[PDB]
């Protein structure tokens, strides 16, 4: 019994959706 | 399919009752507590119910640790004066455990429903023994023949073990191959007919019931 | 191919071994996901139903599982009669398990066969069966059919009532039977009879399970019928107040929360008063938390306006916002914030500071814990602070000060959340950005020295608030950020996200530096080209930051440099485009940025073209007397109008873009239209300048600093044009001065790269399979059917939902638009189909094109789907050819 709300509604850091391009870029450039 | 179709939705009452009764986070009802309730010499069926009724809200996955408790201690339920509510709830929990781990449950249930006269010879049947001889399940305590919940348990196990014995016999023939198929078919037919005849004899009244 | 795979399964279902058949049957739903079109679905469901008819009970259960999984695709079966009849034949089996599986299948298929009388009779006959599995399946099927068809509901309500009230029914079956009554909403009298029955049940079966199921069913019935909803709320409040069982109270809370979510407008003042009194006088904290959840749901709706002094609601909210329980405190402070921002009534401004201090105390409470419940309450509090800052801007300074003071004494997760809150507040109200820069920069310095694992998110959050809070550029803060990155951060992803934020807020020098740093870290060459293109775009936007207000020569040189770097960047970006990552929006966006900059350069040149004198022959006799400059201004006006049209085309090809990106595209289009209108009204048609620039919005509520700058530039340019309307002849240097100054003003505000430029989230498409180098007779005109399915990626309707699909068909010969026709069709289960009729009277070769368009819920048309084309070879039939030849000869 709970609900989720976002503090900032145009925050680009939310991982609600993960797209392929940013996925390989992250996996390719994160250390 | 009877073990699978019982997991199908009906009207969602179980989900609602689970959501509105199990969220009190009073998880004190451990299997150990149920064991102590079952082991009380002045046994209190009311206290026993206050635990197992709470277990009907539990999912099958979270009902696993209680299986040895409500299987091993359910030879006591054959004693006179045991309420039909307790037996019905034990049958319900048995079905919910049969959904998730039927094989181990059946073995423990057969080993639990032994007649227990010369119980120093606690004949601990394994899966292999029951798959070889499915009629072991019918060599239970005589009181199971007039206990409709535990009889329902026994009938579920009997059907399952007859099917398991069909599979085991085919596997054993294939293994020992390197006719025999007719021998296997005759053996399975004799086994099923023997099971039917034993059940029909169970349906007969006893001389005591005749009196 | 679809049929090849369907045959691959079909040999599986024909094997006769149960394992292979079950394997194929459970392999079916993936096929429907691969090929959602009705031909495959129809054939698949027919063969599945045949297997159901002849198969054993486990195969039937597998088919039932598949049918339950694929309730979307069963509207596409089309051949409903044969499918259902070969399914229905198993209800006559003497096996009650087979009958139960058949009943469950019929319940699963209820949407495509309501009012099917044989199925209704089967349900009614199996309801009073003596096999419990059959009775349960009949109850499930009865629920489904009562949900679907009204006649079954009215025909079954009496029987369900007599089974529930019947003393021979066990309590468990009574529990299973009560939720059937929630589907008795089809008629007012039926709903009233069901209400009476449920009241009889709650009074006559007051067990915890029975009353819970009955009250939930009554609540759902009231929600569906929405006429008994007020007295249902009154009944639920009565049970909440009176019934001592915690479970019954908890159910009443859940049902009231459901009703508050569904029909907040129906709540009376008395209902909210009763709920508040119940929350006030209850001793248990879990129940109090539940009722406050209901009240916080209500306060966010119009029910708060209907509720309206210091009432029980405000007294409760003030008492609860200082509770020991964090959840109760969060709900109370949410109620207070909702009252403060929704009600501007001046009788309750004393709780404005109560709300502020409650939010601050909740920050202090939630910052140190770093626990998921505490994180949830912290998110609630920060959302409330953002809402309060928007609603009551005079409180923004205190909110920002509380957040800044709490930043130095909070854990990392809490720090990230308050950084998000500060970013929101500073995006909406950028005046507060200057006051928060010192604290944020200090915390950025101290975090970067020991940034190990979780501080990477903290680093990007801090850099985001630094860029957002900075109205102007950065000189020393920029040096600090670059030093903090280079000193320790080998994490390229952190640097990339911070550069993304920098380019979002227009800090393009910082973005250029970071993207330059990120090269040599990637492994793939297309990502290298993408980062290089980003670096070049950042450099290009940095090039035109040095624009003087009146120096047009410097402006021309700066635009030339920016265009050089933009061309390098677009070459790199094209090199970065790959299949299944085409970067189409990025390519079109930066191409339209390259244009409107070389268009700006041409307009700067035409500013200076006035210094090349007109001919004397034309000078001896009104706009032609200007000379070359008049035709050049006409060409510039047409070019800017075409650019605005292309920006609109990019807008309506961006159905999957977030709102901010669309607003950015709108701003670019409006800048194009502004330059075009200025040219027209100053040079080409000053007499037809239309009405004055009366801004309907006035003080528009901008969502970003870029928006504010763009609208301020637009307003200033329109004011300049209006004051210069007919004051000079079109040979004027003042018209060129105003135009060139408009160029300077538009370019001096740095470009913002929005979310869709980097992240694609929605990703909706159209398959658009259409029935077919195809020969068509001259007399017989083509019958073309187009079927399509709208596709999705993860969350379908993240920003907008498809309401209808517009299918434009056109025919071009000799592959010119000879068969225009449109059909707006509503896709039901993400699937639409329609027939088209295509005339081919003119012999030859025809290129048929079909372009799908999407009309969203609001009504805006989006050009999303593919413009797939097929070629038609239309030839005269042998009969007509021979007859005409014989007649002519």
Curated annotation (Swiss-Prot), chain B:
Domain of life of the native organism: Eukaryota
Compartment(s) of residence: Nucleus; Nucleus membrane; Cytoplasm
Role this protein plays: Component of the integrator complex, a multiprotein complex that terminates RNA polymerase II (Pol II) transcription in the promoter-proximal region of genes.
Assembly and binders: Component of the Integrator complex, composed of core subunits INTS1, INTS2, INTS3, INTS4, INTS5, INTS6, INTS7, INTS8, INTS9/RC74, INTS10, INTS11/CPSF3L, INTS12, INTS13, INTS14 and INTS15. The core complex associates with protein phosphatase 2A subunits PPP2CA and PPP2R1A, to form the Integrator-PP2A (INTAC) complex.
Family: Belongs to the Integrator subunit 2 family.
Name of the featured protein: Integrator complex subunit 2
Organism: Homo sapiens
UniProt gene name: INTS2
Full protein: residues contained: 724 to 954 of 1204
Swiss-Prot record, chain C:
Localization of this protein: Nucleus; Chromosome; Cytoplasm
Phosphoserine, modified sites: 771
GO BP term, example: cellular response to ionizing radiation
Signal peptide interval: none
KW DNA damage (keyword) present: yes
Claim: Coiled coil is one of the keywords in the record: no
Protein keywords: Chromosome, Cytoplasm, DNA damage, Nucleus, Phosphoprotein
Family: Belongs to the Integrator subunit 7 family.
Name of the protein: Integrator complex subunit 7
Organism: Homo sapiens
Gene, per the UniProt record: INTS7
């Amino acid at each position: 019994a709970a609900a989720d709300v976002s503090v900032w509604e145009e925050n680009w850091e939310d991982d609600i959706v993960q797209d392929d391009f940013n996925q390989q870029l992250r996996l390719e450039m994160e250390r | 399919v009877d073990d699978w179709i019982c997991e199908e939705e009906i009207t969602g009452t179980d989900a609602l009752l689970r959501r509105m009764l199990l969220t009190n986070n009073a998880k004190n009802h451990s299997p150990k507590q149920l064991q102590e309730a079952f082991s009380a010499v002045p046994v209190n069926n009311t206290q026993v119910m206050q635990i197992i009724e709470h277990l009907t809200l539990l999912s099958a996955s979270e009902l696993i640790p209680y299986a040895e408790v409500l299987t091993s201690n359910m030879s006591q339920l054959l004693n006179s004066g045991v309420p039909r509510r307790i037996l019905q709830t034990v049958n319900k929990l048995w079905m919910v455990l049969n959904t998730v781990m039927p094989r181990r449950l059946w073995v423990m249930t057969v080993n639990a429903l032994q007649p227990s006269i010369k119980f120093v010879r606690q004949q601990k049947y394994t899966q292999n023994d029951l798959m070889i001889d499915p009629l072991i399940v019918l060599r239970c305590d005589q009181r199971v023949h007039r206990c409709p919940p535990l009889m329902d348990i026994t009938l579920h196990m009997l059907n399952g073990y007859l099917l398991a014995s069909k599979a085991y016999l085919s596997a054993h023939l294939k293994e020992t191959e390197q006719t025999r198929e007719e021998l296997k078919n005759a053996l399975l037919a004799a086994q099923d007919s023997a099971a039917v005849q034993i059940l029909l004899e169970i349906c007969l009244p006893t001389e005591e019931e005749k009196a | 191919d679809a049929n090849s795979a369907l045959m691959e399964l079909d040999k599986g279902l024909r094997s006769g071994k149960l394992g292979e058949q079950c394997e194929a049957v459970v392999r079916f739903p993936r096929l429907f996901q691969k090929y959602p079109f009705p031909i495959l679905i129809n054939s698949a469901f027919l063969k599945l139903a045949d297997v159901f008819r002849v198969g054993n009970n486990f195969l039937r259960l597998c088919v039932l599982k598949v049918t339950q999984q694929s309730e979307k695709h069963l509207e596409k079966i089309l051949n409903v009669d044969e499918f259902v009849k070969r399914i229905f034949s198993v209800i006559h089996s003497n096996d009650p398990v087979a009958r139960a599986i058949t009943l469950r299948m019929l319940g699963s298929l209820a949407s495509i066969i309501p009012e099917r009388k044989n199925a209704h009779h089967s349900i009614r006959q199996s309801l009073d069966s003596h096999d419990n599995v059959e009775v349960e399946a009949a109850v499930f099927a009865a629920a489904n059919f009562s949900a679907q068809s009204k006649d079954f509901a009215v025909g079954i309500c009496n029987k369900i009532s007599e089974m529930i009230q019947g003393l021979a029914t066990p309590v468990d079956l009574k529990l299973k039977l009560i939720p059937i009554l929630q589907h008795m909403h089809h008629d007012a009298i039926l709903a009233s009879s069901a209400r009476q029955l449920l009241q009889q049940l709650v009074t006559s079966y007051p067990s915890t399970k029975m009353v819970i199921v009955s009250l939930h069913t009554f609540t759902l019935l009231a929600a569906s019928s929405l006429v008994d909803t007020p007295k249902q709320i009154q009944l639920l409040l009565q049970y909440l107040k009176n019934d001592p069982r915690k479970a019954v109270k908890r159910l009443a809370i859940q049902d009231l929360k459901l009703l508050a979510n569904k029909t907040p407008h129906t709540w009376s003042r008395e209902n909210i008063q009763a709920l508040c009194e119940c929350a006030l006088q209850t001793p248990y904290d879990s129940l109090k938390l539940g009722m406050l959840s209901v009240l916080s749901t209500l306060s966010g709706t119009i029910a708060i306006k209907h509720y309206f002094r210091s009432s029980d609601l405000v007294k409760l909210a003030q008492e609860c916002c200082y509770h020991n329980n964090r959840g109760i405190a969060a709900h109370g402070v949410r109620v207070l914030t909702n009252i403060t921002v929704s009600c501007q009534e001046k009788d309750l401004l004393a709780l404005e500071q109560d709300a502020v201090f409650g939010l601050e105390s909740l920050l202090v409470l939630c910052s140190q814990d770093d626990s998921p419940g505490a994180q949830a309450t912290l998110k609630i509090a920060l959302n409330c602070m953002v809402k309060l800052a928007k609603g009551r801007p005079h409180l923004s300074q205190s909110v920002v000060e509380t957040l800044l003071t709490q930043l130095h004494s909070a854990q990392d997760a809490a720090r990230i959340l308050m950084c998000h809150c500060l970013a929101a507040i500073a995006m909406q109200l950028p005046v507060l950005g200057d006051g928060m820069l010192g604290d944020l920069m200090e915390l950025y310095k101290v975090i970067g020295r020991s940034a190990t694992d979780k501080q990477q998110e903290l680093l990007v959050s801090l850099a985001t608030v630094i860029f957002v809070a900075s109205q102007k550029a950065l000189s020393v803060e920029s040096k600090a950020v670059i030093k903090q990155q280079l000193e320790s951060v080998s994490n390229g992803w952190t640097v990339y996200r911070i550069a993304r934020q920098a380019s979002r807020m227009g800090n393009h020098d910082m973005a250029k530096e970071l993207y330059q740093s990120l090269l040599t870290q990637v492994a793939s060459e297309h990502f290298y080209f993408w980062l290089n293109s980003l670096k070049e775009f950042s450099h290009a936007e940095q090039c035109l930051t040095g624009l003087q207000e009146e120096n047009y020569s410097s402006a021309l040189s700066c635009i030339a440099e920016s265009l050089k770097f933009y061309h390098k960047g677009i070459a790199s970006l094209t090199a970065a485009s790959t299949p299944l990552n085409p970067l189409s929006f990025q390519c079109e966006f930066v191409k339209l940025r390259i244009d409107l900059l070389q268009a700006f350069s041409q307009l700067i040149c035409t500013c200076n073209s006035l210094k090349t004198s007109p001919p004397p022959a034309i000078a001896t006799t009104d706009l032609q007397r200007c000379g070359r400059i008049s035709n050049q201004m006409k060409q510039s006006m047409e070019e800017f109008r075409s650019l605005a049209s292309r920006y609109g085309d990019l807008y309506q090809a961006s159905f999957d873009a977030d709102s901010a990106t669309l607003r950015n595209v709108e701003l670019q289009q409006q800048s194009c239209l502004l330059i075009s209108h200025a040219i027209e009204a100053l040079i080409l048609d000053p007499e037809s300048a239309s009405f004055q620039e009366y801004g309907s919005t006035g003080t528009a509520h901008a969502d970003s600093e870029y928006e504010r700058r763009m609208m301020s530039v637009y307003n200033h340019v329109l004011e300049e044009v209006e004051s210069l309307n007919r004051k000079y002849t079109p040979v004027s240097y003042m018209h060129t001065a105003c135009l060139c100054n408009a160029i300077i003003a538009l370019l001096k505000v740095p470009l913002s790269f929005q979310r869709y430029f980097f992240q694609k989230l929605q990703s909706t498409s159209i398959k658009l399979a259409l029935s077919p180098p195809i020969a068509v007779q001259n007399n017989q005109q083509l019958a073309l059917k187009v079927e399509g399915v709208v596709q999705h990626g993860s969350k379908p309707g993240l920003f907008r939902k498809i309401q209808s699909v517009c299918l434009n068909v056109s025919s071009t010969l000799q592959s010119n638009m000879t068969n225009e026709m449109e059909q707006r069709v509503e896709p039901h289960n993400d699937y639409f189909s329609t027939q088209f009729l295509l005339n081919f009277a003119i012999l030859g070769t025809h290129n048929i094109t079909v372009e799908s368009s999407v009309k969203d819920a609001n009504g805006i048309v989006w050009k999303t789907g593919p413009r797939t084309t097929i070629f038609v070879k239309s030839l005269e039939d042998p009969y007509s050819q021979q007859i005409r030849l014989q007649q002519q000869q």
